[PDB]
Amino acid sequence: PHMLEQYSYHDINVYSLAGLAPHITLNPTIPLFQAHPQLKQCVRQAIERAVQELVHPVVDRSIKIAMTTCEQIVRKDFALDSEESRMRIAAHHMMRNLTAGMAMITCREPLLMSISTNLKNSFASALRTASPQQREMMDQAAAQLAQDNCELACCFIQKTAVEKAGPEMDKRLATEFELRKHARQEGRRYCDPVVLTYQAERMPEQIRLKVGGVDPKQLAVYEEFARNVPGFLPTNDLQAWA
């Protein structure tokens, strides 16, 4: 973004909602908290509930959007590759990446609205009293806290989606893997016949798909999907009509 990613993929444990707590940010200057420091206790549950209620629909929606695109592009790119394994890993990293991206776009606005609503409500319940000045402070506090913890909450949901996406892509590509295994059982290298003809007859040699593995150089795009997942620090390892 503008502001460097806070979290690496490993920084957030998504086994339970308890993974959120250590990363929650409570700006100590928030006027509501200066006046009523005890209300800081409300914040964790409000964020947890916001994530809890959004994670499964976001995960499902994100996978559904990314799946077709990833399946179609990988099938196209690997149509003359008789080996399942290169296709499988490329698809794995592309699907994970595009799923992470769609999860980000899908959850960010709802998380803001939900985190802030949950806080307003928890604050209002803790102070049954409703001064016009206090409700100003409450609204201010809820908006600030939502903005300050949205990245965290988004990352938790994105990672949940990434973990689910890979196996779903493996299932979707089962027939592609079967085309290649069946060909091999018959002593043949699988090649899509339409693609074989098109590449040989119509594509300039310099950009033509070759029969077999692409030069490892051309996989650079798929390797980048693995390295650079949106939302995470990159990896280094060093009325009616009537």
Binding site: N97, G101, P204, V214
Partner: protein, 270 residues
């Protein structure tokens, strides 16, 4: 031949992030002069994946909105190459089947009025405009089931003149399709939302003229009047500025739009 070899080299250079930005820049300048660029982009290894990568890697800059001019110029070169693929009769169907427009919809949903975002939205709309240019039913049906109409309507309401024009043109093409007209008129709710926005646009046009935008607005109303329930509703809600002499001067030399407007008026008394 040396020109062609440069193009092949740039296409090959799209896969690696190290060489991609320069290749996007050079290739986007060649769409106009290289008729077979679209199939070369589609059928080469990894190219479309790299263009999708460029799109997705902007997502962190959408919300909160921090997109810079440089970021926007780069992804807009990738979008320009996708426009080329969307336009070409040999690649349009595969582009649609890969659901690539869905990855542009997050850009259309942005509302920031800075120049980088306005350019992002304009360029994204151009990809869709290219898709619908040939009025294929397959295209319109995808647009309908993927809920782009609200995205277009929001831009028609609040965008730049240029973005409004392209968004209205997309809506026009959807309406011209029988399925699309039926969809928009399927409920009073859907119809009245479109009509409300067109009405707001007419008022805006009476103050800040735009011949090309007015043309598309008028065509949209004319097509709506082909639907009997819409026609009845339009008898009630058609803006007075389309009945009186408000646009008589600017329409003086626009024979086509004048003819369309007169047919609209005629349809509503029938």
């Amino acid at each position: 031949m040396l020109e062609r070899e440069k193009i092949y080299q740039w296409i090959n250079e799209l896969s690696s992030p190290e060489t991609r930005e320069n290749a996007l820049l050079e290739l986007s300048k060649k769409r106009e002069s290289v008729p077979d660029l679209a199939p070369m982009l589609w059928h080469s290894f990894g190219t479309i994946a790299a263009l999708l990568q460029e799109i997705v890697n902007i997502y962190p800059s959408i919300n909160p909105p921090t997109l810079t001019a440089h970021q926007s110029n780069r992804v807009c070169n990738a979008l320009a190459l996708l426009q080329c693929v969307a336009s070409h009769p040999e690649t349009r169907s595969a582009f649609l089947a890969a659901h690539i427009p869905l990855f542009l919809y997050p850009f259309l949903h942005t509302v920031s009025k800075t120049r980088p975002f306005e350019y992002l939205r304009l360029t994204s709309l151009g990809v869709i405009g290219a898709l619908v240019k040939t009025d294929e039913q397959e295209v319109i049906n995808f647009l309908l089931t993927t809920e782009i109409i609200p995205l277009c309507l929001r831009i028609m309401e609040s965008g730049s003149e240029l973005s409004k024009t392209v968004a209205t043109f997309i809506l026009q093409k959807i309406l011209l399709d029988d399925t699309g007209l039926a969809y928009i008129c399927q409920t009073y709710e859907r119809f009245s939302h479109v009509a409300m926005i067109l009405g707001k646009m007419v008022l805006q046009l009476s103050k800040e003229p735009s011949a090309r935008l007015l043309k598309h607005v008028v065509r949209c109303y004319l097509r709506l009047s082909d639907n009997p329930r819409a026609r009845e509703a339009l008898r009630q809600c058609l803006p007075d500025q389309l009945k009186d002499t408000t646009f008589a001067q600017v329409l003086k030399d626009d024979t086509t739009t004048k003819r369309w407007l007169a047919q609209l008026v005629k349809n509503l008394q029938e």
